[PDB]
């Protein structure tokens, strides 16, 4: 079926540069209109550019705020679309999608991707410090978790048990704090299972190829 | 350059019910109105085109009018997948320019929070920081109130809250509570409290410990 997939997301400073590209598959590239849209964090879809198809000459049109920075291109034999973006700014961070027209009507968008995150910051990329969250000095059912703080860019993934108990798992979006990210993630599971059995949380951040995996433990001593 | 204002922002609603979302541009985009849908983990899909074309494969039961400045969307009786967040888009001039969106809700019954409270793990302490944490989790509807209380006095800087997307299979939501000190203003102070008030009873859940009954 028709799959476009985003990629070349990641972390850069002011003033930097990064180049996205979109592999498109499914259909005739060369007769469809092709897209980039951003969504910045907490705001509406922003359309930034468009390529039109072989019937037009692949001729180009640019939103007014990334006019001259970016320049979006295709590859047509390899059914690859490119955002070239220089100068970047820090409101320039937001997932960035690729899209393609529905054919009847080129200015609307019948595929998008999934698409691919642009952080653009003066912060560096730092592991998480990862935290237990065990009950203290209970019922039939019991809630741990694990508190991940310190971390830049995002994103974290928190695995509980190699995915077994990821049917009661919240995870709770990053928040901004100090110039870095806290997260947490829940589990609830039965007290006839924890402590009985190991309970472990598995942060993985691949920005910093950083893996941490931390057991949690039952109310216990000081000492030990 | 077109602004597109969308509304209501929110909307819960019941499987079964009828319900309209607007969306208004500041100046007339002709018939030129499309309408999306967004869900989490999956890509964006094209409902309508031109105001009131259905996208192929689009069920029935969704519907678009209007021309100028002034458009609707209608779906009739919702079905579970229908709730997800819409946008509308102008498509009648560059630059294309959407609506900022319309949250559609599912309408569950009323539920409580189960709250869990959280010391300070050793390790945190160790590394010179102290964070509470309370879990608010599987309630509905999303708005609550949680409080922080240190040995009985509110506590009003340092909090963070967070919330899950509603969820797809018990159309619950879940939060988290953090307050956030140093060690050393950690330990000036015996108990903490989170307080959490939601419209299913008028007495709050409260969740304690004492720093010092360990
Ligand atoms: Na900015
Ligand atoms: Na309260
Ligand atoms: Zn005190």
């Known amino acids: 079926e028709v799959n476009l997939v985003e990629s070349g997301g990641g972390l850069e400073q002011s003033g930097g540069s990064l180049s996205l590209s979109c592999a498109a598959s499914?259909?005739?590239?060369?007769?469809?209109?092709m897209s980039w849209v951003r969504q910045p964090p907490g705001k509406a879809l922003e359309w930034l550019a468009l390529?039109?198809?072989?019937?037009?000459?692949?001729?180009?049109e640019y939103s007014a705020s990334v006019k001259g920075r970016f320049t979006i291109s295709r590859d047509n034999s390899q059914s690859i679309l490119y955002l070239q973006m220089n100068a970047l700014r820090a409101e320039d961070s937001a997932i960035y999608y690729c899209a393609r027209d529905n054919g009847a009507a080129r200015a609307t968008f019948a595929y998008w991707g999934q698409g691919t995150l642009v952080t653009v910051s003066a912060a560096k990329t730092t592991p998480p410090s990862v935290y237990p969250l065990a009950p203290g000095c209970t019922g039939s059912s019991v809630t741990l978790g694990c508190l991940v703080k310190g971390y830049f860019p995002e994103s974290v993934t928190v695995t509980w048990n190699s995915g077994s108990l990821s049917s009661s798992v919240h995870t709770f979006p990053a928040l901004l704090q100090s110039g870095l990210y806290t997260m947490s993630s829940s589990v609830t599971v039965p007290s006839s299972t924890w402590p009985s059995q190991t309970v472990t949380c598995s942060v993985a951040h691949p920005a910093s190829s950083t893996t941490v995996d931390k057991k949690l433990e039952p109310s216990g001593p000081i000492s030990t | 350059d077109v602004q597109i204002t969308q509304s209501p922002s929110y909307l819960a609603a019941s499987p079964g019910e009828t319900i309209t979302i607007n969306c208004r541009a500041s100046?007339?985009?002709?018939?030129?109105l499309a309408w999306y849908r967004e869900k989490p983990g999956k890509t964006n899909k094209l409902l309508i085109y031109s105001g009131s074309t259905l996208q192929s494969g689009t069920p029935s039961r969704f519907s678009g009018s209007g021309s100028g400045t002034d458009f609707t969307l209608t779906i009739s009786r919702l079905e579970p997948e229908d709730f997800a967040m819409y946008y509308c888009?102008?498509?009648?001039?560059?630059?294309?320019?959407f609506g900022a969106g319309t949250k559609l809700e599912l309408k569950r019954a009323d539920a409580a929070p189960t709250v869990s409270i959280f010391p300070p793990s050793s390790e945190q302490l160790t590394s010179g920081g102290a964070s509470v944490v309370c879990f608010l989790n599987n309630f509905y509807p999303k708005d609550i109130n949680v409080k922080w209380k240190i040995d009985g006095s509110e506590r009003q800087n340092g909090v963070l809250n967070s919330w899950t997307d509603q969820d797809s299979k018990d159309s619950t939501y879940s939060m988290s509570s953090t307050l956030t000190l140093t060690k050393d203003e950690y330990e000036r102070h015996n108990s903490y409290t989170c307080e959490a008030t939601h419209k299913t009873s008028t007495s709050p859940i409260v969740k304690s410990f004492n720093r010092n009954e360990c």
């Open positions: 499914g259909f005739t590239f060369t007769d469809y209109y």
């Open positions: 888009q102008q498509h009648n001039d560059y630059p294309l320019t």
């Open positions: 100046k007339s985009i002709r018939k030129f």
């Open positions: 390529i039109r198809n072989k019937a037009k000459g692949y001729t180009t």
